[PDB]
Design a protein around this ligand. Structure first.
Ligand SMILES: C/C=C(/C)C(=O)O[C@H]1C(C)=C2[C@H]([C@@H]1OC(=O)CCCCCCC)[C@@](C)(OC(C)=O)C[C@H](OC(=O)CCC)[C@@]1(O)[C@H]2OC(=O)[C@@]1(C)O
Ligand SMILES: Nc1ncnc2c1ncn2[C@@H]1O[C@H](COP(=O)(O)O)[C@H]2OC3(O[C@H]21)C([N+](=O)[O-])=CC([N+](=O)[O-])C=C3[N+](=O)[O-]
Ligand code: BEF
Ligand SMILES: [Mg+2]
Ligand code: NA
Length: 994
């Protein structure tokens, strides 16, 4: 029964045809289960461990690198006895690499959690219902609950389903709905209907929502909805219905392939066009047996040299190391991609309650009377440190620590806090954290008492569990609580009646300890306590008290204040009637005022500095909360989002004012406003959507169910370690630490990561261009193969893969976080740089092929074959006279390729150094600036002389150790590349905005 909030209590019973006294009959239960299904969320499952392998080989590059491996495989057996010794090595290694990078991607996906399986960690286990079955309440599986059921809930219980309240048993019912609505203060519920059908959760004051918990009281209600129809059920669907795009870097890597593929097939044809000459030379030798063998031997060499076979490894390795570093900050990164994406973050949307704040009522201010002298009244004001329920913090006076016990007024304040209180504090030994037990407001008082420790109780030698009630416990033994007059809306105060317990102060007689909203309590005070004695309440005194009360309840404070008072001479229990709260106020009269406490849902310590760092990095921080505006804004001020006295004219909006804005204005609002209060889950997602529409990489920070939609939608979702399950599964990152400032570090990390990735991506793709030129040139000049895939792979995976990683360790700039985020659309290579790699590439194809042909024409120990006898090395056998001189198999010599490869390797090493900086000269930015790179070079070159000496290698790689003189040539051919780039860089810096 949706809309049950607008219907009356009888209308809801009628609607389900159930009795409030007995509850559904087992027959009805069976019928409702039939018509409504169990109270749970369907298991969210998709893409098994095998479905990934499927989409794994969907990568265009892979398919091409695979479609090529098939060709190379056919060309393995078609090899006569001369090189059929390693004829199957190539077609295999190519595949072996397709398998490696295959599981490389699966490893970066398999490691994922389950959303719905985590949601059950939030979905209540059991529930309490009354069914015709038995008179007594029955605890059952919360999943077996059905609409129409009569449910009972009491303090500490987790509401099991969306429930229409029928009758409140306690004097009042307070409910903590922060996980769903984001409200920082428990909610006082009622049973009257809520007229407006368009009412939002924060307005449904006669409803109880599944997942929330009871802060105080006992109530009976009727289930309105269950399963996916519950408020949290809806939000879980919103979450499942949100789409996410690929990583901008991934979209960039895909487009690259989409284009690379068009180029490959474009070159395969461009070179094919230069083969019409076969249909002219009067000669035959292989129709459908060899009349197209040499073609597919290069076609594969093209696909191998055009693809950076080692990019996935370098990328995964870089990301993984990044994630490891993040972990050291207690930042658990779920998705490796977001590791880098975090660097382009331009906006950080952030939830308030539990995310920006601790969501743990904390008393940070209190005061008692110092002295009274006629019209003169001074107050002892103190502040308290600590923003959680942990009994950790100190009481200060004028910014300096003091012993509360040395103040008689404080001893009493603490005593009222410990006794006029129905809640307590606890240490969850499981979650390893202090939790409230009962009302947040009352627990704040409990931890206040533990901090004050007025009796200097020994607590250093205690365990976390015992430490939670040591002081409170000491005070609970001084007085015996006879009865308590629970809180009521009219009076707006609460009190307990106590009698002396110990035989130390049995002459003090019965006392009444009161607490409540300031005004009422004070107006009922005839006396004021000064230390241990008492003076009458006078105007001057009252005015001074209220004025300070006013200061805290507004302005820079905007704290929640409670006054603490005690009735020195309370009525006798006999002359009192305790079954009606309408009489309570009168018993809580003629009171002696003792003090006041100021409390609030505190911002996490590291937030203010965090936001200041973001501003310097050109990153906006927007608050998106479900809580009311007054509080939303008060925190914005306290953390730097708004100035202490700034006029939040058009910069703060409620979920409604927002809606009253036309989409245009709405959209614009997301770029101006920094605070959105009384918003709903979809409002958060919408806001995030607007931002992204402006091409802004947005992050979202949250803890509650109400944050899940926006967290998933965000390029980078960030969840608090102490937040809900849904929120954590919808995030790529989790601050198990709850330290909001780890975000700024993660961003910094991400920026250093992005720059380094850009650099090594460029490096690898760069040599790929030159490699393709070398293959092209040879396939064009008719010249023999200077480089073969067996060599291209080793270099693309090892020789270069190593320096590329060392570039991932490129030190970040000194102002890495003193500049704005770079655009997502920003291309990695274009404009000048496109030309630079265009030239470097060309220089490589020419150098490698030229180094080969050089050995084939000028090597003092090589054939002096003419350029013509090289371009026509094929017809060497038949037309032997034209090539009268040596052996026709010299065109398969390792020296030429080794010459070409050794030039390639050396050029890349040189290009590695050129890649340390996009436009900075090796003069301005020394090579040793990155020691790791220098190492990767020595290690790459060693892995080279290794491939030229260890027999098993030079054999399969078709190589042969070069002369100590041939190297001198490789050097002369290679080194200059440093000069070429040094020049291209120079042009960019000076005669360009480089
Ligand atoms: C891997 C090797 C090669 C040679 C390749 O075909 O790369 C092209 C290509 C697909 C792009 C180009 C290459 O295009 C050319 O070099 C022009 C044609 C001349 C070839 C003639 C044959 C002798 C990149 C490599 O080259 C230069 C030299 O500037 C730069 C850049 O790529 C990147 O920024 C990498 C993205 C991960 C891309 O223009 C890119 O296409 C895009 O959409 C981009 C935006 O991606
Ligand atoms: N709609 C309401 N109807 C009646 N009382 C309300 C309402 N809203 C808030 N209150 C009471 O007004 C206070 C906020 O107003 P300031 O700080 O600005 O002066 C609130 O403090 C406590 O109940 C609240 C409370 N609590 O959880 O919210 C718990 C209490 N307790 O048992 O410990 C006591 C409250 N109290 O007021 O005494
Ligand atoms: F929990 Be919030 F601030 F929406
Ligand atoms: Mg929240
Ligand atoms: Na996300």
């Amino acid at each position: 029964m949706e809309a049950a909030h607008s219907k009356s209590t009888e209308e809801c019973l009628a609607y389900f045809g159930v009795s409030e006294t007995t509850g559904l009959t087992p027959d009805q239960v069976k019928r409702h289960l039939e018509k409504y299904g169990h109270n749970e969320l369907p298991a969210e499952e998709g893409k098994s461990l095998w479905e990934l392998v499927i989409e794994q080989f969907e990568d265009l590059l892979v398919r091409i690198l695979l479609l090529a491996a098939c060709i190379s495989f056919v060309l393995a057996w078609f090899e006569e006895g001369e090189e059929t010794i390693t004829a199957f090595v190539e077609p295999f290694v190519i595949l072996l690499i397709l398998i490696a990078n295959a599981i490389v991607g699966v490893w970066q996906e398999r490691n994922a959690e389950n959303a719905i399986e985590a949601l059950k960690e939030y979905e209540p286990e059991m529930g309490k219902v009354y069914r015709a079955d038995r008179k007594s309440v029955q605890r059952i599986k919360a999943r077996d609950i059905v609409p129409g059921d009569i449910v009972e809930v009491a303090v500490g219980d987790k509401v099991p389903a969306d429930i229409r309240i029928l009758s409140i048993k306690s004097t009042t019912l307070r409910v903590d709905q922060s996980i769903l609505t984001g409200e920082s203060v428990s909610v006082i519920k009622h049973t009257e209907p809520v007229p407006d059908p368009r009412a939002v959760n924060q307005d449904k004051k006669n409803m109880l929502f599944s997942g929330t918990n009871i802060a105080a009281g006992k109530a009976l209600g009727i289930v309105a909805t269950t399963g996916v129809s519950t408020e949290i059920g809806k939000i879980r669907d919103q979450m499942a219905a949100t789409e996410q795009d690929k990583t901008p870097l991934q979209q960039k890597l895909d487009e690259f392939g989409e284009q690379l593929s068009k180029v490959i097939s474009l070159i395969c044809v461009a070179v094919w066009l230069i083969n019409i000459g076969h249909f002219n030379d009067p000669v035959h030798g292989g129709s459908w047996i060899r009349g197209a063998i040499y073609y597919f031997k290069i076609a594969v060499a093209l696909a191998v040299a055009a693809i950076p076979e080692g990019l996935p490894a370098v990328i995964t390795t870089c990301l993984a190391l990044g994630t490891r570093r993040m972990a050291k900050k207690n930042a658990i990164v779920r998705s490796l991609p977001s590791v880098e994406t975090l660097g382009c973050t331009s906006v950080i949307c952030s939830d308030k309650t539990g995310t920006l704040t601790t969501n743990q009522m904390s008393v940070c201010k209190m005061f008692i009377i110092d002295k009274v002298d006629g019209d003169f009244c001074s107050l002892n004001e103190f502040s308290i440190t600590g923003s959680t329920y942990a009994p950790e913090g100190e009481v200060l006076k004028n910014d300096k620590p003091i012993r509360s016990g040395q103040f008689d007024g404080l001893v009493e304040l603490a005593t009222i806090c410990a006794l006029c209180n129905d809640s307590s504090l606890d240490f969850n030994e499981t979650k390893g954290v202090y939790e409230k037990v009962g009302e947040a407001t009352e627990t704040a008082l409990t931890t206040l008492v533990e901090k004050m420790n007025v009796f200097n109780t020994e607590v250093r030698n205690l365990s976390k569990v015992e430490r939670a009630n040591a002081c409170n416990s000491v005070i609970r033994q001084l007085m015996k609580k006879e009865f308590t007059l629970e809180f009521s809306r009219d009076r707006k105060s609460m009190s307990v009646y106590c009698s002396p317990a110990k035989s130390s102060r049995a002459a003090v007689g019965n006392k009444m300890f009161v607490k409540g909203a300031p005004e009422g309590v004070i107006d009922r005070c005839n006396y004021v306590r000064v230390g241990t004695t008492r003076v009458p309440m006078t105007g001057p005194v009252k005015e001074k008290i209220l004025s300070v009360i006013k200061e805290w309840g507004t302005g820079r404070d905007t704290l929640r204040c409670l006054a603490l008072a005690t009735r020195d001479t309370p009525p006798k229990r006999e002359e009192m009637v305790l079954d009606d709260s309408s009489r309570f106020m009168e018993y809580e009269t003629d009171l002696t005022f003792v003090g006041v406490v100021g409390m609030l849902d505190p911002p996490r310590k590291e937030v203010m500095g965090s936001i200041q760092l973001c501003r310097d990095a050109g990153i906006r921080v927007i608050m998106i909360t479900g809580d009311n505006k007054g509080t939303a804004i008060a925190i914005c001020r306290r953390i730097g989002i708004f100035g202490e006295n700034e006029e939040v004219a058009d910069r703060a909006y409620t979920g409604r004012e927002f809606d009253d804005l036309p989409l245009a204005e709405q959209r614009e609002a997301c770029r101006r406003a920094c605070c959105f209060a009384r918003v709903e889950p979809s409002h958060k997602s919408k806001i995030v959507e607007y931002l992204q529409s402006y091409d802004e990489i947005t992050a979202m920070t949250g803890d509650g169910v109400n944050d899940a939609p926006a967290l998933k939608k965000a390029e980078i979702g960030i969840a608090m370690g102490s937040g809900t399950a849904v929120a954590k599964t919808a995030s790529e990152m989790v601050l198990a630490d709850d330290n909001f400032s780890t975000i700024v570090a993660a961003v910094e990390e991400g920026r250093a990561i992005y720059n380094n990735m850009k650099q090594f991506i460029r490096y690898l793709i760069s040599s790929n261009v030159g490699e393709v030129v070398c293959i092209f040139l040879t396939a064009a000049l008719g010249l023999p193969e200077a480089l073969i895939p067996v060599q291209l792979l080793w270099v693309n995976l090892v020789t270069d893969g190593l320096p590329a990683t060392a570039l991932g360790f490129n030190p970040p700039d000194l102002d890495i976080m003193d500049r704005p985020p770079r655009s997502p659309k920003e291309p990695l290579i274009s404009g000048w740089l496109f030309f630079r790699y265009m030239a470097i590439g060309g220089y490589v194809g020419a150098a490698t092929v030229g180094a080969a042909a050089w050995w084939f024409m000028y090597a003092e120990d090589g054939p002096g074959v003419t350029y013509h006898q090289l371009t026509h090395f094929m017809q060497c056998t038949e037309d032997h006279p034209h090539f009268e001189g040596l052996d026709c198999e010299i065109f398969e010599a390792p020296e030429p390729m080794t010459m070409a490869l050794s030039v390639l390797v050396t050029i890349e090493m040189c290009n590695a150094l050129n890649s340390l900086s996009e436009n900075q000269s090796l003069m301005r930015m020394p090579p040793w600036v990155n020691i790791w790179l220098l190492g990767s070079i020595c290690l790459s070159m060693s892995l080279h002389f290794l491939i030229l000496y260890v027999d098993p290698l030079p054999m399969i790689f078709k190589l042969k150790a070069l002369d100590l003189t041939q190297w001198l040539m490789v050097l002369k051919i290679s080194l200059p590349v440093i000069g070429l780039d040094e020049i291209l860089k120079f042009i960019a810096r000076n005669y360009l905005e480089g």
